[PDB]
Amino acid sequence: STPITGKVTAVIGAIVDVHFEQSELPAILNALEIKTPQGKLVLEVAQHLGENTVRTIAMDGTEGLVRGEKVLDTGGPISVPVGRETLGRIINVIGEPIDERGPIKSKLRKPIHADPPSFAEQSTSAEILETGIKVVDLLAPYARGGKIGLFGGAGVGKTVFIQELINNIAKAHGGFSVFTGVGERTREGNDLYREMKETGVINLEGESKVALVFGQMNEPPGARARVALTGLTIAEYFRDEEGQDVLLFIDNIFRFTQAGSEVSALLGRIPSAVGYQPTLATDMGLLQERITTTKKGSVTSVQAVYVPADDLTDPAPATTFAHLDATTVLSRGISELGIYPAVDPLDSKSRLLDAAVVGQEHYDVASKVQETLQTYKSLQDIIAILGMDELSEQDKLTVERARKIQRFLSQPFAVAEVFTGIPGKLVRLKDTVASFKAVLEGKYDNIPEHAFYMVGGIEDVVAKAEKLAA
Amino acid sequence: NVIQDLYLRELKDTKLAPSTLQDAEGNVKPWNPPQKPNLPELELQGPEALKAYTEQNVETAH
Amino acid sequence: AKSAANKLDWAKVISSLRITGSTATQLSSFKKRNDEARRQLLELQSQPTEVDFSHY
Amino acid sequence: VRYEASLRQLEQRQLAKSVISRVQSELGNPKFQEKVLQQSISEIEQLLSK
Amino acid sequence: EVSSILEERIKGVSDEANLNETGRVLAVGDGIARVFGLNNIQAEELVEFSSGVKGMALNLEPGQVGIVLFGSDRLVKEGELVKRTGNIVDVPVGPGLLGRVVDALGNPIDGKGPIDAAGRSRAQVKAPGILPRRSVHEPVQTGLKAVDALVPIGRGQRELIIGDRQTGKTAVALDTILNQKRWNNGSDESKKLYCVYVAVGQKRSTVAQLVQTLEQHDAMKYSIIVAATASEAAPLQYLAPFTAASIGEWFRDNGKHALIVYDDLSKQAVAYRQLSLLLRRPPGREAYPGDVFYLHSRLLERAAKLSEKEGSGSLTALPVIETQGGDVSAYIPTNVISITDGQIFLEAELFYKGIRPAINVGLSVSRVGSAAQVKALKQVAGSLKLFLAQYREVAAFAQSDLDASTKQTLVRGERLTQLLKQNQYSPLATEEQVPLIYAGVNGHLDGIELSRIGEFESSFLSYLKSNHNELLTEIREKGELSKELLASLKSATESFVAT
């Protein structure tokens, strides 16, 4: 087609070098398509090396390639399809379906590289997203347009947490959502595909309030890198062009880190600390700045992160830790205690927590909750060795309240009607503030600890007190 | 020169489409109406209170 | 003014201390005192009473 | 005021895209030839002053 | 309209493009263009591409001149003409940047008009000499009572604010800036510290909030915000504190005083790491480049209080270092600690326990310290240092039957700890710091119940304000506490204590 014809020279893995002719001039960040019996292999131009010999990265696999192979140039960053017809369709990295509902695209395509909106563009918001998950709402207030971050160790039901969030927040939410999966396993994928068909957020007939971008780790690291870019642009199209607010969801961004580390090394850019690319910070910055509350729209990303061996002192989680608005850490111990969610609430910090911002009553209550739980933890060592009863009566009452509160964090989940069988609880923000306040006042210290366990709000807590009584 | 051409072309050809006041109304917050005088704050109204206060507290506790 | 009212209020609290049955006199006094201090916050919560048609 | 400022920004970027249409007009025209002559002689005069 | 004004401006460029030396990219990969040409180019000189990209020229190699692009590689491609601007990096300097959030180049990212400032002066210049300095003696008061007393700060000095990530490190810093409004209002231009906040790697949304908060507290008019945001490129980040320092030099040179807060040099480090690695220079200890010590040191000795022949002026600085796990043992913290003259080390546990300020009193030192302390505050808080020392030992005594002395210490100490709490984003006046601490010293506060300390404080301040703002103003203006004032204060405190 285009005079820009290059002949492959070296297949050295994903790195494939092409020899465009002297007349022709390619450019960095372009997309090359090579017609193959394996669709069109896309190579992203990442360097010029001289005499129109580029060093480009493959997206798709590199098997069977013949060095000398004619290479067409798309002419710029990979172009996905965009539209409101992207809703409820699985879009692969190059844009091609996986939902197999034929041509995805409205009348538009867009490039997947775009710039992060400037300082002037930025528009601040103090709006509060509500999770409907009482513990999350109270002790980690979320924000609309935010950059929520589900930091945690190994597969802490990471998908499960996201599924609950989609179950509650998405259905309630009127905008769109984008579920982006970076190297996620195809078992999890099939469950998610099925699950969101079931929750009907993928509405088989009619519009879906979610769009899907499923990336599989099987796909080479290069594809793993620019699945993120693809998803990011889809959210931008929604935010900007459709004007609507969105709720972005990305999974798992450590997989994004790993992928970036690999192709850095392959690019010859010697990987920095703990083998993580020297460009990690700036790559994170481009993704993160791209996700924001503009005056065109507002997008609330919820990004899963895998913290290797639960070491957050490791530079890669730590670097991400700075860039995210509203961190949460999911802890194994609390999971094992049976509490769903598994978040250690003394290990969760959301930017919104300022006293008047979350409201003085909410704040005061939250200071008290934090102390009450913290008292139980501090006293746990004393209770353990010295003994429970040697502690003060006041301390013991605080412990008893903490045990009740601890199991009042336990909210059985709707998406754990398959992981526990017990239905969800969607508890309003005001209702949570009130019910937690009551507990602290000690009004329901006549209600067993286990009568808070795996039940919702105060009404439920009383009902299970009665149920156990019966 | 292109400098002159650019200057000329742009200026001469300038196209401004005006937008309706009605479209502006949609895109701006519309005026909120007067608050009205209403009832003012008033206390001690009715001789119900007067008889009640005199009678109820005609004595102090011994 | 309101400071007159309140000085007399607290004087009356310690007078009502000496007697009894006036143990809700002080609560009425407390209510009016409240409303006087509320009115001051009302009057201080006086945002500009006219449009800024100068600048805007 | 907010829609007014937005409308001013919107008008300039719309009129910017209308300039792109004028750019395409200039580079098509044999004003492209005649202004190349002007540029050529201007460079001759300028560079001779060096 | 406005469009017409722009077109007129375009008509106003037509300049002879006789580029004495041009370049052509030979190969561009990784933002490291290798250019053929640029024969007489100066090192670190600004170069303008066909793509319009700006660069610096760290490598002048014989066959190729290795530009480091400030710009993105997106438009860059091989062969690109590289005009030689012929000017090493310079940024506008002057009082024009007051209330102006600007990027490193000087572009107003807030768009508060094109920056009109006195001159544009180059980014890097070497630090003041031995004899071009005179010793610090002038305090600076951050409003944070604990900072002002426990680690009193002065002018033209460096002293860290080293602490754990996202503990509102920026919040602690911002409080100082806010208190500078009070002094700023004040006529003396040493009292006018024209603050410069250098937001490094900080996402534009975060800095937008910062800007908004600053606007709420009307601080943007002595504040300058040099911004290299998360997106902003590693050359920009690298040159960002240097660029910022030059802005400071105009004030310093004008003999005025100012405060530059480099936040955080840890993210500056990463950018240098990226740069060094991209030039394939070996990465130093902890994979952070070997000349990071040199880099930081070059910057940090520009913070200096000049001599009186150099018109007694300064550029006070307060670098912020982010301690990943709290490790001051980490290579960049250890280096920086050595370089600087004091550190303040916020304690994460204290932060968690809601003690804000969260300062770790032991791990905070100021070397200049009490030399740059208000005399009044010095008198009434020498005692405070000793009391707190005992309180630290008697902290562990909180695990009880205790010696009466110990139990008294514990009570006195707990009340003091609460007193030094100061709710974030609310500075205090020095004339109101000194009475409260005096009370505590006299043990007046010890008696007052812990919960009622808070009520006591605000009330005491109003009580003092009503009873004797003659005393407060006298104390403020004298800046010393005379025996007569301390006498009156003990009495006044007794009167307040009774209520």
Swiss-Prot record, chain A:
GO terms for biological process: proton motive force-driven ATP synthesis; proton motive force-driven mitochondrial ATP synthesis. Its main location: mitochondrion. It holds the Pfam family ATP-synt_ab. The modification Phosphoserine is found at residue 335. It is found in: Mitochondrion; Mitochondrion inner membrane. It is an enzyme of class 7 (translocase). ATP binds at residues 152-159. CDD domains: ATP-synt_F1_beta_C, ATP-synt_F1_beta_N, F1-ATPase_beta_CD. NCBIfam families: atpD. Present with 164000 molecules/cell in log phase SD medium. F-type ATPases have 2 components, CF(1) - the catalytic core - and CF(0) - the membrane proton channel. CF(1) has five subunits: alpha(3), beta(3), gamma(1), delta(1), epsilon(1). CF(0) has three main subunits: a, b and c. Belongs to the ATPase alpha/beta chains family. This is ATP synthase subunit beta, mitochondrial. The gene is ATP2.
Swiss-Prot record, chain B:
Keywords: ATP synthesis, CF(0), Hydrogen ion transport, Ion transport, Membrane, Mitochondrion, Mitochondrion inner membrane, Transit peptide, Transport. GO terms for cellular component: mitochondrial inner membrane; mitochondrion; proton-transporting ATP synthase complex. It comes from the Eukaryota. F-type ATPases have 2 components, CF(1) - the catalytic core - and CF(0) - the membrane proton channel. In yeast, the dimeric form of ATP synthase consists of 17 polypeptides: alpha, beta, gamma, delta, epsilon, 4 (B), 5 (OSCP), 6 (A), 8, 9 (C), d, E (Tim11), f, g, h, i/j and k. Mitochondrial membrane ATP synthase (F(1)F(0) ATP synthase or Complex V) produces ATP from ADP in the presence of a proton gradient across the membrane which is generated by electron transport complexes of the respiratory chain. F-type ATPases consist of two structural domains, F(1) - containing the extramembraneous catalytic core and F(0) - containing the membrane proton channel, linked together by a central stalk and a peripheral stalk. During catalysis, ATP synthesis in the catalytic domain of F(1) is coupled via a rotary mechanism of the central stalk subunits to proton translocation. Present with 6140 molecules/cell in log phase SD medium. This is ATP synthase subunit H, mitochondrial.
Swiss-Prot record, chain C:
It comes from the Eukaryota. It is found in: Mitochondrion; Mitochondrion inner membrane. F-type ATPases have 2 components, CF(1) - the catalytic core - and CF(0) - the membrane proton channel. In yeast, the dimeric form of ATP synthase consists of 17 polypeptides: alpha, beta, gamma, delta, epsilon, 4 (B), 5 (OSCP), 6 (A), 8, 9 (C), d, E (Tim11), f, g, h, i/j and k. Mitochondrial membrane ATP synthase (F(1)F(0) ATP synthase or Complex V) produces ATP from ADP in the presence of a proton gradient across the membrane which is generated by electron transport complexes of the respiratory chain. F-type ATPases consist of two structural domains, F(1) - containing the extramembraneous catalytic core, and F(0) - containing the membrane proton channel, linked together by a central stalk and a peripheral stalk. During catalysis, ATP synthesis in the catalytic domain of F(1) is coupled via a rotary mechanism of the central stalk subunits to proton translocation. Belongs to the ATPase d subunit family. Present with 6820 molecules/cell in log phase SD medium. This is ATP synthase subunit d, mitochondrial. It comes from Saccharomyces cerevisiae (strain ATCC 204508 / S288c). The lineage of its organism: Eukaryota, Fungi, Dikarya, Ascomycota, Saccharomycotina.
Curated annotation (Swiss-Prot), chain E:
Belongs to the ATPase alpha/beta chains family. It comes from the Eukaryota. One of its GO terms (cellular component) is mitochondrial nucleoid. Gene3D superfamilies: 2.40.30.20, ATP synthase alpha/beta chain, C-terminal domain (1.20.150.20), P-loop containing nucleotide triphosphate hydrolases (3.40.50.300). F-type ATPases have 2 components, CF(1) - the catalytic core - and CF(0) - the membrane proton channel. CF(1) has five subunits: alpha(3), beta(3), gamma(1), delta(1), epsilon(1). CF(0) has three main subunits: a, b and c. The record marks 364 as: Required for activity. The keyword Manganese does not apply. The modification Phosphoserine is found at residues 14, 135. Present with 41500 molecules/cell in log phase SD medium. It is found in: Mitochondrion inner membrane. PROSITE patterns: ATPASE_ALPHA_BETA (PS00152). Its main location: mitochondrion. GO terms for biological process: proton motive force-driven ATP synthesis. PANTHER family: ATP SYNTHASE SUBUNIT ALPHA, MITOCHONDRIAL. ATP binds at residues 163-170. The keyword Cytoplasm does not apply. InterPro entries: ATP_synth_asu-like_sf (IPR023366), ATP_synth_asu_C (IPR000793), ATP_synth_asu_C_sf (IPR038376), ATP_synth_F1_a_nt-bd_dom (IPR033732), ATP_synth_F1_asu (IPR005294), ATPase_a/bsu_AS (IPR020003), ATPase_F1/V1/A1_a/bsu_N (IPR004100), ATPase_F1/V1/A1_a/bsu_N_sf (IPR036121). It holds the Pfam family ATP-synt_ab_N. Keywords: ATP synthesis, ATP-binding, CF(1), Hydrogen ion transport, Ion transport, Membrane, Mitochondrion, Mitochondrion inner membrane, Nucleotide-binding, Phosphoprotein, Transit peptide, Transport. GO terms for molecular function: ADP binding; ATP binding; proton-transporting ATP synthase activity, rotational mechanism.
